[PDB]
Symmetry: C3
Subunit: 322 residues, 3 copies
């Protein structure tokens, strides 16, 4: 019965007026209050589904899911969140200019989920749609709903990320393709709002982009959590995994995670991966209790249900007992 | 009542139950008024955020054997907003989906699982085959270069919103329309022409030589104008260009020039830049003229014309939701 | 007793016809008929509301995929659809949904899915030739016209002819297995090197022995329909599968042999019923659709009733 709303002021009626028909393109489109609301509402959706209670808290809405690259987990997670909420979805998986398409699609539906391998088209579609857009994609750019469900996963094991206490600091290692990884970019930016330290593990051409480091550095400094130990760079997993609460692995033989290479990590460390994987994580880590990547994917349902509930409701009633 | 015209909705719904809508001539005058009446009611409902769920727990199969945004997404949305359910086919080859099995077999089977089928196929002929073996009603969402009757109905709803007198068949109140672009392959032009020719309407047909309206559509138009005493030698005029063609028309109907039907890009290129609509080329048009385009569009209409209060093509697209909800409700309700 | 059988069936995967025992078959056929009754009289059919399924189809099987989707929707549930490592794929996919309908031409991928899925899978066709819901609707179609296959009455024997490509005909193998559970005798009609496999005859002989229904008349082999079709309650025809012959010449001197006509039906029983799992390549001439012995489209119809029946039994509560 004690959720984060017994811990922080979460006026869920005010915040939902502010989120009514909000578009979510980038993780900076979600503020402190909006993040609190999503995390609280994600927890309610988790409790409702896990007790097999009625989840149809958004009946009679119609979304269009546009996915112009293969997805699976993310596409099927959104489709599933929509159906569980009692709403319907029509689907595209591939002349017409982007703006015409979103002008027409937005006359037929209440909201659009959009994935495009192009980084720019989502801005175009946001300016021609008469309806709110959720970024599911936008190649190499951002993945805001990934960030939120990663955060929710992290908050579940490490409640103190929310406390903003100078003395309770979360250390996270990102590993793999940091350059192209829109999951790293989104989550970096989000974490850097909190008392967090970052180890970036990769090989030279895949290093974290300069301007992500500038955003992390900016945001850390804004809350007085910036020091010369905030952002360390690493060649290998030996150095890179030491004293991290979180290991976050990414797609792309130089950074393969094994039960051997987890021996010298913290006891309380938790392994994330947005998925899919190839060789980055060996089977045998699935059976290590520090593997939580499958709970993470699961959380994607509660968090995308929450977001959809917060953006498009009170137009049933509420998983806001508020 | 449309203001002056009673529809007995009871009678006409009985007459529409399980009707297939393949060609615009499958729909008569009384049925058209029923469709226009019901369309305005679903419009009023969706615009006042009222309950639209008046055809619940029906199951449609939408079968699209060629690309579509507007048409396939309006139908899906009409189905969902009405409270029914839809399974989708989007194999972008007619020959994938059949793969060896005859059309009559494929529809005899598919028809046993669902209450109605929405059918689009680049082939003209297959829809007739589907219709003769389907055990459930079929709505044609487009049969190649043939026809596109739900485009007709939503066009005419649009035109009637702005020029209510097409319905009067008054000798003194004539609608003039310009059709511009691919008239030979415009399944959209073929359906709306035929339909419009039942009323007091004159036709400007603007195109290049090898895209001119088919001969046999000029026969249907002629016969239908004569039938009602609205035919003269000025009814149907053919035009090189937009100067001559757009003179004194209430409706400018632009079509997409089909790239996807042209063995030579320079054959396509010379013709896709032939009929481009700008605000300049709208300066010498009637104040009350309205622009329609079934969309999508490429070069045909310059972005500047969106901001013109003569442009209604976005309203036309929207109207298709209300008309497809209307057609589905009238054909598929029960008891 | 419905509720004993259900509890045993709740959260059951169905991959192989052998996964369904006699009492499960009884429940499936009793429920399929319940749904047929309901849909035929336009009564409310929404007896499995608010459940979410994923359909993964990794080959063209458009009827089957469409039947399952229609079953899910008519029941009052919702479905999301996938169209073209596997154990990762299914761990994830199965947290999002209540159930999966999987079809894969791979032998190897369906066993893997079942072991990584936290949710029941229903096989909709695979690489091992198993297609249990085809077998169950085939069996329901027979039971419509010959209620007695269930009775295991020594006095009431069903007789079935299987015809065409019995070698590659995976639906035949599956349905044989299921039919040999009962008092049934088998005419296998083909040319030699497209004969019913050795080791299917063997599972049939085993089952008929198990239930005291085997004799020297249990299994006959035939050259031609004249003889093949003599005193049989059921004619099950099959696609001669071009598909499975490298070189189209070997296929052509094998595709023309067994064509069902009204002429070749004159000298069958009055009650005989003609099934085909379809598509068909007019090895059944169109004239036979109008013969009241053709039931292949009612067979396709029954798939709705059987796939609804199954989903209901595996996923209620």
């Amino acid at each position: 019965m004690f959720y984060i709303n017994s811990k922080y002021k979460i006026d869920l009626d005010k915040i939902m007026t502010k989120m009514k028909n909000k578009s979510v393109i980038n993780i900076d489109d979600v503020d402190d209050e909006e993040l609190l609301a999503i995390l609280y509402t994600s927890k309610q959706f988790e409790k409702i589904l896990k007790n097999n209670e009625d989840s149809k808290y958004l009946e009679n809405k119609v979304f269009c899911s546009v996915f112009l690259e293969p997805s699976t987990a993310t596409r099927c997670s959104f489709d599933a969140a929509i159906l569980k909420l009692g709403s319907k979805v029509l689907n595209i998986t591939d002349g017409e200019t982007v703006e015409d398409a979103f002008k027409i699609l937005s006359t037929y539906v209440d909201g659009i989920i959009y994935r495009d391998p192009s980084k720019k088209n989502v801005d175009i579609a946001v300016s021609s749609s008469s309806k709110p857009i959720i970024n599911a994609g936008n190649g190499t750019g951002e993945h805001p709903t990934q960030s939120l469900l990663d955060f929710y996963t992290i908050h579940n094991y490490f409640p103190f990320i929310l406390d903003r206490n100078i003395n309770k600091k979360l250390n996270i290692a990102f590993v793999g393709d940091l350059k192209n990884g829109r999951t790293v970019h989104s989550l970096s930016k989000l974490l850097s709002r909190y008392n967090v330290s970052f180890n970036f593990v990769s090989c030279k051409s895949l290093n974290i982009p300069k301007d992500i480091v500038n955003t992390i550095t900016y945001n850390l400094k804004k809350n007085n959590f910036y020091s010369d130990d905030s952002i360390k760079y690493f060649d290998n997993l030996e150095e890179g995994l030491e004293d991290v609460h979180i290991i976050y692995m990414t797609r792309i033989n130089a950074f393969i995670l094994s039960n051997k290479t987890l021996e010298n990590t913290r006891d309380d460390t938790k392994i994330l991966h947005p998925l899919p994987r190839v060789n980055e994580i060996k089977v045998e880590v699935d059976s290590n209790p520090k593997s939580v990547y499958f709970t993470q994917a699961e959380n994607g349902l509660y968090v995308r249900m929450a977001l959809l509930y917060l953006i498009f409701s009170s137009t049933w009633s509420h998983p806001q007992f508020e």
